[PDB]
Design an enzyme around this catalytic site. Structure first.
Site, PDB file in Angstrom:
ATOM      1  N   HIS A  18      10.766  -4.604   5.753  1.00 26.62           N
ATOM      2  CA  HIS A  18       9.376  -4.858   5.324  1.00 26.62           C
ATOM      3  C   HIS A  18       9.310  -5.475   3.916  1.00 26.62           C
ATOM      4  O   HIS A  18       8.462  -6.326   3.694  1.00 26.62           O
ATOM      5  CB  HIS A  18       8.628  -3.539   5.397  1.00 26.62           C
ATOM      6  CG  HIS A  18       7.239  -3.675   4.966  1.00 26.62           C
ATOM      7  ND1 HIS A  18       6.335  -4.360   5.731  1.00 26.62           N
ATOM      8  CD2 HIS A  18       6.612  -3.265   3.845  1.00 26.62           C
ATOM      9  CE1 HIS A  18       5.173  -4.333   5.114  1.00 26.62           C
ATOM     10  NE2 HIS A  18       5.312  -3.659   3.957  1.00 26.62           N
TER      11      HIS A  18
ATOM     12  N   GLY B  37       0.788  -1.249   0.000  1.00 25.37           N
ATOM     13  CA  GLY B  37       0.000   0.000   0.000  1.00 25.37           C
ATOM     14  C   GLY B  37       0.814   1.290   0.000  1.00 25.37           C
ATOM     15  O   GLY B  37       0.180   2.381   0.048  1.00 25.37           O
TER      16      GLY B  37
END
Lengths: 284, 284, 284, 284
Positions: free
Chosen positions: D263, D39
């Protein structure tokens, strides 16, 4: 009680003469307690413990010590592992004042110093109260350096009012505690070349061959005293995952966590912290 | 204060008439607090809170309720999800006594009942104190069932004095609290066919289509009140890893952990628990 | 491949002659790997790893060593801290067989041995694979002793078939892998009087003044190689919360957790375990 | 394989026409797999997964879908809870392409979409692979918002090149993967006014009364398929403590953590990530 009425100096030998500033209050009371402040730019005893000293001094003979590099204590440009250096100075001070076995209360860097004191001079430390302490904390989940530690580093490289305010704002849950005045007072002390000298020195001090002395989470299973760990749930400097090794390995550990509270428990939860500390150290 | 002087009954409609036994003390005091006991074989209010009721009654109007299936309360053979059933009964009792918004203190099963009460009747529960509570606990690390829960199950299948003593011994850190007398008293209540009826029923009650009502760790982010979680570090029924979702998601949570303490904090750390509870609920 | 066809012995010196039994397979394969079994009663290389050896020997030269006190290795009545004793024995075997730097795979006690070996002789240990390992595990949430450790101690005080069965049942998620045959096989090996003296020797060592060498969670920040930690989510001996310090402090750590798996990963997730180990040690 | 050669569009109905862009590769391979990107600003299927697609397309029929609001999919100014909106869009695409039950691989926001899809349409989701996923992650120890989330919000209020750079630097352990080109590429896609409206739309959705559908840590106990959670130890957006509820409550969960990885696992551990995914989804 004032800064000025409580103020005291002593001189101790830590690889040569070393001036220590401290505050003394409640001289009537039998039970001595030593307060060691947090290690942010411009921190000192009187301001770190300003919501605590008056209350604690009703119960205890309070010795609130400006650690080397802070407040009105000497600010040398060179020293070994900070917490060991501050512990040696405090031990100097205990010998000078005739103290035997004394409880210690320590916030952040000051909790590191308290723990290092308690490991190096085990018979000299009674019960410990440690709020968001360094040294015994190991952040099992948070990637290091944390957001709090990054902001402290950015200030030491670029010591502006803006970088200090950004650092103070991750100290607390409620940002409105970081008032224009507070920032002005802390920035005025932090920005002196003596303070920045100390601030640099303290940085280098952790990344040497004696980094083992900073990993106190390896040694606190040897602490025999009761130890009250206090943490804010929203602490972004020494996050809550950093309490877990100490809580497990310290045989007589206790842990109190405050929701809606950052790194400065003694400020953001002053009343609850004052009462925990008074009760834990025996009411005096 | 005695069992007999404090004793009271009420009748409430929970899918038909339901007799509730409770103790009442400190009728002088303005602030009411309700005590809900743990859920081990033969537990009831008076014995679960025997080191607590006298101290708390100096400050508060104490209502210590025997949950359905326990003490002198009705012991039906059939009921739905236990904590929902006990919560409905307590709500019956609140309506009968004219209570509005009241703080709750709950150990183990009783903490489950307190939380389920606070979620189903949100305006009726004030501050919660929960010791090693079921329902909101989810053991992120401990394989389920835990050693404590296994011993409780073994007793329900083979209700001997030996299986009860084995269960009581994983309740506490210091095994000497489990005295020959204590075991005799608890075994005498636990072994009645009425009690074993209740004990079976409560087992079945958790493994149905409304198991969601037992997973209160999914719903406590909605609690708006202050909530004090208290745990023993050595709790082997509802281990400490089971505090973590509640401490994170309850906005005004606090957590106190006692080293050298099992599941029965209110017994093994009675003095520290009494003082936490008194302070947290406002001194009265 | 059979016990007899793979069976080898070597005499090494640790405070005098010490007979080591090991299994060898996949001779001529470029990459040697050493397997170290767990510490359960009647544990040995061939019973612990029999199926995994055939699979790993397709890729690796496998040396599966019976640790001192186990299988057909010498069973002395006394020794120092077991893991440093087993690591010295292993160093002897590496020197005798001219092994340079070799990867190590260890389960439980053997994982601790692998770690102690990798810290004391850093240039001789390659990549480590540790399944639910002892020594570097510190159960941050599980009260000690755990359920698995208590059933091991119980067997050791009362070495009956029924106590061995209780122990094996908390090694696995699927209690059907604990066959009457497995019990009979392990009871036979565990109940010989030399094995009994080896477990009484193991007692005094772990409970003795050389315990700090057992606490390798304090030391694994020195490991410079890749380390793959492998855990059953339902491990009741060394539960999952014991992975956290090693995962945080080993620079090149990886962790793999399997749901629906106990302490015996190499049995209960046989295929996925073989494939992880093969991929991680380089495909061979 | 190129953006243009793999590029496909389909029109599906979610409160009216919705153009979905996706990439297709490995046509004719027996097993279809759907990839869902993260996102972050200017995130898309091809930029997120470009290298992984070539590798997975050797084994799988890969559909890499641009989620609504991203890449070349429609960028509406308003929608419900994003993950249920993206999952309805995905359901539309599965129905249009006659897909039955398909495995899903999702990074961050796409992991939440995959989960919401697997809960709402259980018969249409196969095995899940989730890298540092949103929605089912609840940071039990990290104060929220995390460092990564704060730099994402900052970019969204002040969409400069320099704020995008600050965001990308906390996606990875090795900050050298954040090239001047990567910044320029992502800034170009993120700063178009339709992408800006899509991120302002994303704002109001996550901060709005449909937030409970975002809290999938409450729901993943219903997932019946194998789920592989994949985490960078140094993830500063969705840190490792967010894995714990999903790991505990998904019956057939696995977790794999990589040290020295942020991440973006699919970039920073490219090879090990491709090999885990290939093995876990069945080798194809």
């Amino acid at each position: 009680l004032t800064f000025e009425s409580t103020s005291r100096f002593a001189e101790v030998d830590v690889d040569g003469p070393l001036k220590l500033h401290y505050h003394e209050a409640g001289v009537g009371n039998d039970q001595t307690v030593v307060l060691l402040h947090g290690g942010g730019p411009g921190a000192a005893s009187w301001t770190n413990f300003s919501r605590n000293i008056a209350v604690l001094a009703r119960h205890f003979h309070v010795l609130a010590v400006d650690q080397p590099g802070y407040g009105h204590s000497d600010k040398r440009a060179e020293h070994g592992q900070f917490n060991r250096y501050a512990a040696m100075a405090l031990k100097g001070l205990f010998d000078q004042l005739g103290l035997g076995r004394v409880p210690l209360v320590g916030n952040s860097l000051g909790g590191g110093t308290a723990v290092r004191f308690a490991l190096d001079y085990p018979a000299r430390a009674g019960r410990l109260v440690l709020m968001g302490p360094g040294g015994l904390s190991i952040n099992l989940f948070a990637p290091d350096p944390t957001e709090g530690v990054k902001r402290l580093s950015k200030f030491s490289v670029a010591p502006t009012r803006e970088n200090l305010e950004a650092f103070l704002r991750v100290m607390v849950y409620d940002k409105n505690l970081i008032t224009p005045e507070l920032v002005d007072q802390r920035f005025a002390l932090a920005s002196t070349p003596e303070s920045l000298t100390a601030t640099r020195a303290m940085g280098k001090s952790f990344a040497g061959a004696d980094f083992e002395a900073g990993m106190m989470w390896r040694e606190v299973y040897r602490l025999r005293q009761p130890v009250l760990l206090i943490w804010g749930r929203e602490d972004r400097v020494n996050p809550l995952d950093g309490a877990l090794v100490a809580l497990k390995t310290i045989p007589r550990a206790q842990l109190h966590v405050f929701g809606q509270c950052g790194h400065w428990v003694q400020v953001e939860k002053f009343d609850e912290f004052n009462k925990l500390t008074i009760e834990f150290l025996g009411g005096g």
